[PDB]
Amino acid sequence: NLSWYRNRLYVDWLNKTAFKTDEGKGKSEYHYNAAYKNDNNAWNDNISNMKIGLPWEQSKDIDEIPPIFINQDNV
Amino acid sequence: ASVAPLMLAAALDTAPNVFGLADGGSHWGAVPYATSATLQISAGLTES
Amino acid sequence: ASVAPLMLAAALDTAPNVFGLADGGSHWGAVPYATSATLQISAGLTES
Amino acid sequence: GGNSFNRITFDTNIIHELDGDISLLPPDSLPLVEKLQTSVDELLSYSTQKDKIGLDAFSGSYGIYF
Amino acid sequence: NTFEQSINNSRLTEKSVKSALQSYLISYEKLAQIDTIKELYVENIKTHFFLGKTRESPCQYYWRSGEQLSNDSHHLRWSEWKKVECNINGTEEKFFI
Known part of the structure; x- marks a missing residue:
């Protein structure tokens, strides 16, 4: 998803890969990323491959999902 | 860049x-290799 | 190319x-290494 | 005896100000980016140097840049 | 030095100096977000030393120094944020620093 924040263009994405890290858990951590176009049309990189567990457990569609969007994670 | x-x-x-x-x-x-490569890029930049 | x-x-x-x-x-x-290598190729191309 | 020792001081946090009225923080860089997207004349003007950047904040920790 | 040798053309236009000005502000906006973590007051050499992380999930620490007494006047003799080069910048987790 695109998002216009701090007069910049952020873009955020997850990655569907399991990463059982606790090795008893399932769907434990997923990689989350961010970037921002500068005014030289050059892409920097905010977050870059940070591990976050899914807010929703297992369903393709949920009702509401906002991210904290300053370095943290909730619904 | x-x-x-x-x-x-x-x-x-x-x-x-x-x-x-x-x-x-x-x-x-990997971090010392990128330090060496970054410093080579800086040397080539200054010679340019 | x-x-x-x-x-x-x-x-x-x-x-x-x-x-x-x-x-x-x-x-x-790997994708940031290819970004760096692509941008080095672009710099060498522009100097050529 | 031929050695020295330190203290580890685990789990420190953000230092906002130095001891005795010295701020380590800059003024807000968001309006300068707001005014980059307009002309240069609306950025390098006295009205943007009044409220967005102080007189004492023009010197200090980030003063060389200003 | 980045600005001074970006406008180093021969038949200059205003587009080039505005582009170098944009690059200067984009480089400044990173340094305006450095998060000061660790302090150190050396007493022999009358200096402070700071250790500053940036606001990315990779760490990318920096350092600076104020070069006199904190209350000799209102002014310390400050310094540019410069990058600490080696082995801190991996995406790992630290007990202490």
Whole structure:
């Protein structure tokens, strides 16, 4: 998803890969990323491959999902 | 502009790579290789 | 013409490599290394 | 005896100000980016140097840049 | 030095100096977000030393120094944020620094 924040263009994405890290858990951590176009049309990189567990457990569609969007994670 | 992707790639290479009863895969010298490559880019830039 | 094979190689390197009770093998920083190498090729091209 | 020792001091946090009325923080860089996207004349003007950047904040920790 | 040798053309236009000005502000906006973590007051050499992380999930620490007494006047003799080069910048987790 695109998002216009701090007069910049952020873009955020997850990655569907399991990463059982606790090795008893399932769907434990997923990689989350961010970037921002500068005014030289050059892409920097905010977050870059940070591990976050899914807010929703297992369903393709949920009702509401906002991210904290300053370095943290909730619904 | 080719300086920050090298340091970010060497940051990402120190994360472990192999999972599931084989810990590790993290390249240990990746951040000094990117330091050397960044400093070579700086030398070529100053000569340009 | 040596720009698109680097980005395609870094696309293919992020796929997992080892299978069978050892997940992973995917090079994490491959796309920033190809970004740096592509931008070095662009700098050498512009100086040529 | 031929050695020295330190103290580890685990789990420190953000230092906002130095001891005795010295701020380590800059003024907000968001309006300068707001005014980059307009002309240079609306950025390098006295009205943007009044409220967005102080007089004492023009010197201090980030003063060389200003 | 980045600005001074970006406008180093021969038949200059205003587009080039505005582009170098944009690059200067983009480089400044990173340094305006450095998060000061660790302090150190050396007493022999009358200096402070700071250790500053940036606001990315990779760490990318920096350092600076104020070069006199903190209350000799209102002014310390400050310094540019410069990057600490080796082995801190991996995406790992630290007990202490």
